[PDB]
Amino acid sequence: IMLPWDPSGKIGPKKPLPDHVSIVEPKDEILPTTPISEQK
Amino acid sequence: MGRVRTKTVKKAARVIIEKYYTRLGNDFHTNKRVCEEIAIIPSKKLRNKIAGYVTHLMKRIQRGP
Amino acid sequence: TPDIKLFGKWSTDDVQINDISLQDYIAVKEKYAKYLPHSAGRYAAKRFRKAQCPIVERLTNSMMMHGRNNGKKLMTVRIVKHAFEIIHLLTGENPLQVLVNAIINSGPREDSTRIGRAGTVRRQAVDVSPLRRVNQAIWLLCTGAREAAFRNIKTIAECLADELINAAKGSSNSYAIKKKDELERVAKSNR
Amino acid sequence: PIKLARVTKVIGKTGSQGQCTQVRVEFMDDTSHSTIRNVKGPVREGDVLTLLESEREARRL
Amino acid sequence: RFGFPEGSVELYAEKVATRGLCAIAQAESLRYKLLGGLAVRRACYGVLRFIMESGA
RNA sequence: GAGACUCUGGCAUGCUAACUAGUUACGCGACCCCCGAGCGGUCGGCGUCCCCCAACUUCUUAGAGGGACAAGUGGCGUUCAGCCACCCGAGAUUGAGCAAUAACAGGUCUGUGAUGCCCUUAGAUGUCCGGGGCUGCACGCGCGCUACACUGACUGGCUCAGCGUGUGCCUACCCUACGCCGGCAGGCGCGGGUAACCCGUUGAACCCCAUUCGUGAUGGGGAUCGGGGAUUGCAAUUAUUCCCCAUGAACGAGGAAUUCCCAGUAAGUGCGGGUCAUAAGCUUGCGUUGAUUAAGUCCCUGCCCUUUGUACACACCGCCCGU
């Protein structure tokens, strides 16, 4: 039997396979900026 | 005595550019770091080989699609 | 010493390696000389790196042979150091010139390949490169003195010097020459 | 009629086993004249030979 | 057997979860089925179907 | 599946910290006492003196992170994939470990309380005891040890490692300092070690420096055979191992043929572990001295891919024609 627990869970078996890769999606690399002085 | 890159290396290099073309530039040791920061690879050496193909690839993107 | 490099006694200068072809492969007359035989010896990794090895060190390497004596550089240095000294007496001249003269006139100029015409043995004369001339020279000289001194009261030092002097000049009674002329004979036959 | 010659470029190996090699040469005394010959041993571009048969004009073996 | 002194030991039976990722539990289940005449075909597919339902 | 992955090797004066791996500078806190010099300072030292309030960098101590990716450069290229020579530096890398689908009437019922079926079972193929043999010799085959000498053998003096193991085992047992006696077989006394704290700085050989020998089957070589000593055990004959005197054979680099191998590799040299009451010419690891030749090809032997041809399919160790 071949287990799925590829990232962790309740228990993590020696995290992931040497060749499986996961990218994170930005959602934020747009930033249409202008010289606004938004003090905060 | 030969050095060819595999599908895992190439495909991820493609995806990384197609997301984060602004983070990256023409320097290897910065391109090295950002890939570590965004992505979670299991191995230091796999980290290296991906970036080396990324940087080779940027110089092509400068001119010619 | 910051201007001259001896072997303790005699000098790498005052000698003229006298050819063009056998240039570029012999490290004796170069100002990049050494006081002694073997250094570490990285000179085996690449293809043409062995050309940049001092000629005496090359010679020293070849002597220890036939299994009874492997890994005995220091023994061979004793032979070499005694050997160049005995040269000095018999002619009062730098043995280095006597050495290059042999290496020069001991490399065969012509040879036959074993082109057996796909299983029907008949050869064909060809030409020889510089580096192989240098190698077969040393191999022939080293397997001179050896077989001469095997069951005899002479020692390697005398027998080495004897064949060495007779090969520098054309003596026609040394192992090196008797074989060199033979190979040229055979090539001219099936030329 | 002993002669000399420098090498210009290496063409390819040859022989039943890949021991001889084809080369092209000029005679170091006239530059226009030229031949191609078979040699034995490690030979690189930039070398000098002692030719005896000054002319053979060899071909594919 | 192992010569421990009296009271030096204590036992705890404990329920397990995940009947379908462990293998020994499946093998010992598969034993008695084959002993009782059943078809090698129906059984092997059945345990195989169950393990895949589990999460493997 | 290959790759990726794990282990090991190679680099860091950067981090971490140290008598149970353990020093090295200072004080010499002592060296002993002159321990030498010398009329003195100065040099010298490996262990011997400690609690452990005089540093850890450089061995082995061992954890973390770092570092190398064809990244920079010149050429070559469908200017893609990528290839060759170079700049700094370790530039594909010692290396191994793991290993797919389908299979072979491959081997193992003498590894198993893994097991079918047959055989036997009190005058036993069970299970104990005594002895013997598995080693017997007109011949043939293979894996290896020693040597055929002077680049050497003998006799004295100098100088350097590393992987390891070690006392009470499931049914029976350690590595050894120091002394006293004799060459060893040794043998008596006391000590240490459940271990880099004791053996132990594992004072190893080959090497190296000097005497004897001088081409003489010779002091090369050490089979064979006699005699005497001791040690293990209940027991040494068919000599089980070891020591001493004598004995002193074949062998002058080996025909046809054939094996292994290109970087700390071949080869030489000897230390440990396994077997072990008694023990290595074997195997498995370890270091130590350290070459020649290539950087290519399909000619001999074999492997992979495509195209082709076939009267073969237990598959050319095939099928098959006549007298």
Secondary structure in 3-state letters for C1-27? CCCCCECCCCECCCCCCCCCCCCCCCE
From the list C175, C4, C155, C17, the residue with the least C-alpha distance to C96 is: C17
From the list D6, D14, D2, the residue with the least C-alpha distance to D40 is: D14
**Given in angstroms, what resolution was this structure solved at?**
3.1
From CA C175, how far away is CA C140, in angstroms rounded? 7
From the CA of C53, how many Å to the C1' of F209? 31
Q: Which long-range contacts (CB under 8 A, 24 or more apart) does B21-30 make?
A: B22/A29, B23/A29, B24/B54, B24/B58, B25/B58, B26/B55, B26/B58, B26/B59, B27/B55, B28/B52, B28/B55
Enumerate the nucleotides of strand F whose atoms come under 7 Å of any protein CB. Answer: 2-6, 66-72, 80-84, 92-93, 148-152, 207-209, 214-215, 263-264, 266-268, 289-300
Task: Provide the CA C106 distance to its chain's centre, in angstroms.
Answer: 8
From CA B28, how far away is CA B34, in angstroms rounded? 10
Q: Which of A18, A24, A26 sits opposite B43 (nearest CB)?
A: A18
Contact E20, E50 (CB under 8 A): yes
**DSSP at E50:** H
From the list E52, E51, E13, the residue with the least C-alpha distance to E29 is: E51
State the smallest CA–CA distance between residue A10 and chain E in angstroms.
Answer: 12
With 0-12 / 13-18 / 19 or more C-beta atoms within 10 angstroms meaning exposed / middle / buried, residue C134 is: buried
Mutation to test the A interface, candidates E21, E30, E52, E53, most A Cβ within 10 Å: E21
Q: Write phi, then psi, for D25 (nearest 5 degrees).
A: -145, 155
Contact C171, C181 (CB under 8 A): no
- Which alpha helices (DSSP H) does C94-155 contain, by range? 95-104, 130-148
Q: Write phi, then psi, for C178 (nearest 5 degrees).
A: -60, -25
Sign of the alpha-carbon dihedral angle for E53, E54, E55, E56: negative
Q: C77-90 burial by CB neighbour count: b if 16+ within 10 A, else e? A: bebbebbbebbeee
Which residues are CB-neighbours of C82 under 8 A, at least 6 positions away?
C157
From CA C8, how far away is CA C73, in angstroms rounded? 18
In angstroms, the first-to-last Cα distance of chain C is 52
Q: Write phi, then psi, for C125 (nearest 5 degrees).
A: -55, 145
In angstroms, the first-to-last Cα distance of chain E is 40
Our CA angle for C71, C77, C83, nearest 5°, is: 135
From CA B37, how far away is CA B32, in angstroms rounded? 9
**In the numeric block, which tokens belong to residue C168?**
């520098």
From CA C9, how far away is CA C16, in angstroms rounded? 19
D6: three-class secondary structure by DSSP: strand
**In the numeric block, which tokens belong to residue A7?**
């990232």
**In the numeric block, which tokens belong to residue A6?**
């590829």
Residues of A in Cβ contact (< 8 Å) with E47 = none
Per-position DSSP letters for C46-75, written without gaps between them: SSSGGGGSBHHHHHHHHHS-SSSS-S-HHH
From CA E8, how far away is CA E14, in angstroms rounded? 20
Q: Write phi, then psi, for D49 (nearest 5 degrees).
A: -115, 160
Q: What size, in residues, is chain E?
A: 56
* Secondary structure (H, E, C), E3-36: CCCCCCCCCCCCCCCCCCCCCHHHHHHHHHHHHC
Residues of C in Cβ contact (< 8 Å) with D38 = 113, 126-127
User: According to the entry, how was the structure determined?
Assistant: cryo-EM
From CA D8, how far away is CA D33, in angstroms rounded? 12
- Which position has the token pair 């490399």? C107
From CA C53, how far away is CA C16, in angstroms rounded? 18
